[PDB]
Design a protein around this ligand. Sequence first.
Ligand SMILES: CCS(=O)(=O)N1CCN(c2ccc(Nc3ncc(C(N)=O)c(NC4CC4)n3)cc2)CC1
Length: 300
Amino acid sequence: NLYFQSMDPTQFEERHLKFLQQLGKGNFGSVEMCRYDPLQDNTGEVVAVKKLQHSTEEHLRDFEREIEILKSLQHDNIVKYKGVCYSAGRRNLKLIMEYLPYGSLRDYLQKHKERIDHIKLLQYTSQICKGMEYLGTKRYIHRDLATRNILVENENRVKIGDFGLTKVLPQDKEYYKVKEPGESPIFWYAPESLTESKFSVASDVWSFGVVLYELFTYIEKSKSPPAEFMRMIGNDKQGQMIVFHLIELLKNNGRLPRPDGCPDEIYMIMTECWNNNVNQRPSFRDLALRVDQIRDNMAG
Ligand SMILES: CCS(=O)(=O)N1CCN(c2ccc(Nc3ncc(C(N)=O)c(NC4CC4)n3)cc2)CC1
């Protein structure tokens, strides 16, 4: 009470934060591109600015947690925290982060196939695993790993973003049981997350297997995880029946198919990530090493 938590409300002052562009919607919120131009000279750093879409009390609390999580992370493959802007005369909050010009990896794979080959896909895979290794050291569970939530700086660098669903493991447990769920990205979820609301490093590994699938499908029409799972389940199914059939399919070894042109060895990594036995899934350290060895074992 006596002394409020340390904040730097003069680091990004609203009057100097200039709108450049609307970018998109990250889990609970909206993101814009702005320029921070304190020397009112039409220059300054270009930044991404996340704001809430519905500024309820509960959402503001969740947003504070997301901000504290991101501020605690510093890694080449994690989107950079820059600060907070307390706008509306210090009666609102916005998160200031670095801006990555190529947007989401999901969009980049679709818009920039001219510059993507398997080498690049494996580089992105490696980078994602290394970011995730780093999150694990902090006991953070991302809970929404998907190509839509990975951002592209340039042809040789991607970074994990969207920490809006991230949870911190309890001190004494290796899983977090989410007792509030929102809308869930079910087609990226591990079976124990679907059936028990349990999230862990190992369920992030499951979702990483889906990301690896996404990369090798090159975000092709009809090959997305939702499209393929719905084809397997029955495209006419609606509502909870979808979830019931997804659970049953996964529990009895139904899996996304090997993408066209995907090496068997990469599909094997996917299928090892998609182990119903939580403890048998590889670690992110295992995966980064394996992917880098595959890359390094190529000629040259
Ligand atoms: C060509 C198809 S397009 O015309 O439809 N199109 C594609 C490119 N694009 C775009 C989106 C984001 C970014 N950069 C970015 N940087 C950092 C963050 C961050 N720190 O969260 C972020 N978050 C947002 C992802 C929520 N977004 C750059 C470009 C929107 C318009």
